[PDB]
Design a protein around this motif. Structure first.
Motif, mmCIF file in Angstrom:
data_model
loop_
_atom_site.group_PDB
_atom_site.id
_atom_site.type_symbol
_atom_site.label_atom_id
_atom_site.label_comp_id
_atom_site.label_asym_id
_atom_site.label_seq_id
_atom_site.Cartn_x
_atom_site.Cartn_y
_atom_site.Cartn_z
ATOM 1 N N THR A 204 3.136 -2.977 -14.311
ATOM 2 C CA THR A 204 3.446 -1.941 -15.263
ATOM 3 C C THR A 204 2.772 -2.273 -16.466
ATOM 4 N N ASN B 154 -1.865 5.726 -8.518
ATOM 5 C CA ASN B 154 -0.630 6.687 -8.258
ATOM 6 C C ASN B 154 -1.016 7.579 -7.090
ATOM 7 N N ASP B 155 -1.927 7.480 -6.206
ATOM 8 C CA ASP B 155 -2.098 8.348 -4.900
ATOM 9 C C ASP B 155 -2.868 9.496 -5.458
ATOM 10 N N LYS C 106 0.239 1.883 -9.535
ATOM 11 C CA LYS C 106 -0.323 1.494 -8.187
ATOM 12 C C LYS C 106 -1.707 1.844 -8.275
ATOM 13 N N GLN D 38 -5.096 1.226 -5.759
ATOM 14 C CA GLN D 38 -5.579 0.945 -4.589
ATOM 15 C C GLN D 38 -7.079 1.189 -4.478
ATOM 16 N N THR E 242 3.335 -6.801 -10.724
ATOM 17 C CA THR E 242 4.344 -7.226 -9.794
ATOM 18 C C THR E 242 3.922 -7.574 -8.340
ATOM 19 N N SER E 243 2.704 -7.141 -7.651
ATOM 20 C CA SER E 243 2.087 -7.829 -6.584
ATOM 21 C C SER E 243 0.853 -7.179 -6.289
ATOM 22 N N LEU F 21 0.262 -3.478 -7.788
ATOM 23 C CA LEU F 21 1.194 -3.011 -8.330
ATOM 24 C C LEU F 21 1.790 -3.682 -9.810
ATOM 25 N N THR G 125 -4.019 -3.334 -2.763
ATOM 26 C CA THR G 125 -3.148 -2.677 -3.659
ATOM 27 C C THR G 125 -2.626 -3.544 -4.819
#
Ligand SMILES: O=S(=O)(c1ccccc1)c1cn([C@H]2[C@@H](O)[C@@H](CO)O[C@@H](S[C@@H]3O[C@H](CO)[C@@H](O)[C@H](O)[C@H]3O)[C@@H]2O)nn1
Ligand SMILES: [Mg+2]
Length: 138
Positions: free
Chosen positions: A25, A102-103, A87, A89, A131-132, A23, A21
């Motif tokens: 912007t 984003n899912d 996001k 994945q 972010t991570s 994350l 994952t």
């Protein structure tokens, strides 16, 4: 918030059922993002959203072997947007990487580099605030 470019270690590489994952912007006026799953200098899986390739937005995927890019696979579904949080994945499956943003499912990329337990780094770069970055087994 991490600084890009960022390296996420993948010790022992990747394995089916691992979910990575990312994350972040997208910056204002972004031009590009790149994820590079690396086996040494080789890039097993390059995932490259391009915001302005001929006033077109496109995602380019490829593999780099011995410093030579292979045949591209392109996706015109483009979920990223300047200024917005995302996001990514990456689900490792036996025959391919499966990518959702984003899912929502986005694309699959068949394994060209077959030694998954030696894909031991993920580089994250380009026009983002990161972010991570992490992974788990689902
Ligand atoms: O990390 S980066 O985003 C990156 C780092 C720093 C600044 C900007 C970006 C980044 C992207 N790249 C590569 C990589 O994306 C590659 C994938 O196939 O595409 C090539 S361009 C490719 O050129 C072909 C002629 O050789 C042309 O035929 C084809 O049509 C066209 O697509 C990219 O230069 N390396 N680094
Ligand atoms: Mg298949």
């Amino acid at each position: 918030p991490l600084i890009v470019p960022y390296n996420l270690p993948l010790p022992g590489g990747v394995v089916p059922r691992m979910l990575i994952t990312i994350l972040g912007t997208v910056k204002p006026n972004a031009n590009r993002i790149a994820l590079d799953f690396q086996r040494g200098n080789d890039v097993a899986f390059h995932f490259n959203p391009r915001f302005n390739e001929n006033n077109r937005r496109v995602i380019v995927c490829n593999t780099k072997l011995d410093n030579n890019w292979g045949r591209e696979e392109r996706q015109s579904v483009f979920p990223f947007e300047s200024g917005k949080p995302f996001k990514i994945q990456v689900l490792v499956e036996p025959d391919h990487f499966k990518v959702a943003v984003n899912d929502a499912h986005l694309l699959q990329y068949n394994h060209r580099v077959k030694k998954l337990n030696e894909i031991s780094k993920l580089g994250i770069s380009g026009d983002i605030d990161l972010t991570s970055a992490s992974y788990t087994m689902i």
